[PDB]
UniProtKB/Swiss-Prot annotation, chain B:
Homodimer. May form a heterodimer with RPRD1A. Associates with RPAP2. Associates with the RNA polymerase II complex. The lineage of its organism: Eukaryota, Metazoa, Chordata, Craniata, Vertebrata. GO terms for molecular function: identical protein binding; RNA polymerase II C-terminal domain binding; RNA polymerase II complex binding. It comes from Homo sapiens (Human). Keywords: Acetylation, Nucleus, Phosphoprotein, Transcription, Transcription regulation. Preferentially expressed in a range of tumor tissues including colon, lung, liver, breast, prostate, stomach, uterine endometrium and cervical cancers with higher levels in tumors than in adjacent non-tumor tissue (at protein level). GO terms for biological process: mRNA 3'-end processing; positive regulation of cell population proliferation; positive regulation of transcription by RNA polymerase II; regulation of cell cycle process; RNA polymerase II promoter clearance. The modification Phosphoserine is found at residue 124. This is Regulation of nuclear pre-mRNA domain-containing protein 1B. One of its GO terms (cellular component) is nucleoplasm. It is found in: Nucleus. The keyword Nucleus applies. Belongs to the UPF0400 (RTT103) family. The chain holds residues 176 to 301 of 326 of the full protein. Interacts with phosphorylated C-terminal heptapeptide repeat domain (CTD) of the largest RNA polymerase II subunit POLR2A, and participates in dephosphorylation of the CTD by RPAP2. Transcriptional regulator which enhances expression of CCND1. Promotes binding of RNA polymerase II to the CCDN1 promoter and to the termination region before the poly-A site but decreases its binding after the poly-A site. Prevents RNA polymerase II from reading through the 3' end termination site and may allow it to be recruited back to the promoter through promotion of the formation of a chromatin loop.
Length: 124, 126
């Protein structure tokens, strides 16, 4: 459970992103603004933009998939954290109860130690 | 933050085996170290001295364990706080990332619109 929660936290940390984002950011506005198509008046220009558009579709699809998967991992971690927190609360209150019991036990043993110091004087 | 939460979880985990073992040692103490009404059964000094040695060991074991356990409760309350804080931070990060994904889905939909329209525009060209 603890081992599982650690693996999840490490994985998420290790899942580059910034590089793919920068690649997408560097796309020119002509790939996403259909009002600019009127500037295309020959097939050479159309073909240049078409290549750029194709790359953009691949980059965004790959990246959107990656991001969506990370959200899923985060929702899963969130569920694991809530469950682990509820279990720790229960363990904590159990241990609080136990510490009181052991303090009482030590006080009884101390009472025996004290009373034995006196009892031993009455013996041969 | 994540690195800190991991260190805390590992540390706390490491204590637990040592804990159960010390608790078993305390459980094996005999009734005579904790029940003063039974002292009446001690009728010579040799028996008294044997019990006195055992009682001293018990006092040391319980005192050391009670100090250990109190420190562990502190560590657990701290971990509990760290978990609540980390959970709240993950909720915030999650909603930020949800927003960003919507923006990139919208961007892809625009690019798809351009692609479609360019395929058609190309047919009108010489």
């Amino acid at each position: 459970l603890t081992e599982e929660l650690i693996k999840a936290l490490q994985d998420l940390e290790n899942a580059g992103d910034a590089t793919v984002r920068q690649k997408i950011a560097s796309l020119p506005q002509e790939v996403q603004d259909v009002s600019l198509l009127e500037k295309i008046t020959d097939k050479e220009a159309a073909e240049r933009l078409s290549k750029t558009v194709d790359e953009a579709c691949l980059l965004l699809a790959e990246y959107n998939g990656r991001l969506a998967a990370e959200l899923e991992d985060r929702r899963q971690l969130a569920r694991m954290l809530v469950e682990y927190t509820q279990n720790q609360k229960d363990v904590l209150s159990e241990k609080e109860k136990k510490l009181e019991e052991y303090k009482q036990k030590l006080a009884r043993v101390t009472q025996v130690r004290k009373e034995l110091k006196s009892h031993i004087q009455s013996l041969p």
